[PDB]
Subunit: 164 residues, 2 copies
Amino acid sequence: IGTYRHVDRATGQVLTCDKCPAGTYVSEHCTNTSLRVCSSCPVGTFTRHENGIEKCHDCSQPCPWPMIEKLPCAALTDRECTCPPGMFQSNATCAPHTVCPVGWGVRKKGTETEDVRCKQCARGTFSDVPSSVMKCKAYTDCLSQNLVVIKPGTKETDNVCGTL
Amino acid sequence: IGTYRHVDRATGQVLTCDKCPAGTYVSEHCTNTSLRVCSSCPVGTFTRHENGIEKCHDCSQPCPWPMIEKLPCAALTDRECTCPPGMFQSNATCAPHTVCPVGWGVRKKGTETEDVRCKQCARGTFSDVPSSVMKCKAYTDCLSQNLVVIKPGTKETDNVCGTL
């Protein structure tokens, strides 16, 4: 654990104290006959690193709805805000991801910062349900099924498999 | 930040959740539509690493007097006990460092785990005060002083400098 220099009030001696671990602050500095005492950051405050400071840093303001916390305000971390799942950040706030319609599928997964990116299903694949999450799905293989294709698929429906 | 797998109670789905940073624990696991929520370790408890656990670890029992804390019980660390300054650990407890008498000096500084180690002052050095901290001190150089030695030193006293 690292150290910091401190000027002792009563004697003017410059001492080398031990740092206080992340999550605490120095509540009494060392002196020439006593070790420094660390205390834990009071609720509302944090420090991220081992430090020599006398107050913890204040956590930021509560997340503006509809944003939520993906990290809390705790001794070691400031709160950190995010658009909840299924939404993404645009300018001001959060907007719901695009829903890819039937016949389209997710090319790129939506995130907290970017919207979903849809593509039309490629030949041989289909998507039969609106979804901001699902990918185009390969037709059932009628060959490797023993069967043959009774009805072709479309970008919206699987091909139907059978015989005769 | 790392992840852990969790089995969702209601659906049996195996999810990949985000870990909770050191100092917190998981107070609600992620589900297929919500992020995991971390809470800070309640007073009395800690976790040292980013984790997926549901309770923080309990801190050890208070330090047995005359031992004191060199780390507190805080969100990120168990308390850690030490013999206070000027004492060192022997078997059971703490004992005061050896005091090096006049004519001796510290060869090796005492620590929380080892006693001071004294040596007789070497020729040309002296120590005039009992101390478990101070080293033998070089005589005042009467040459480089312009003066000559009026009275030799001993292991206990500086040589005295003058002229005629």
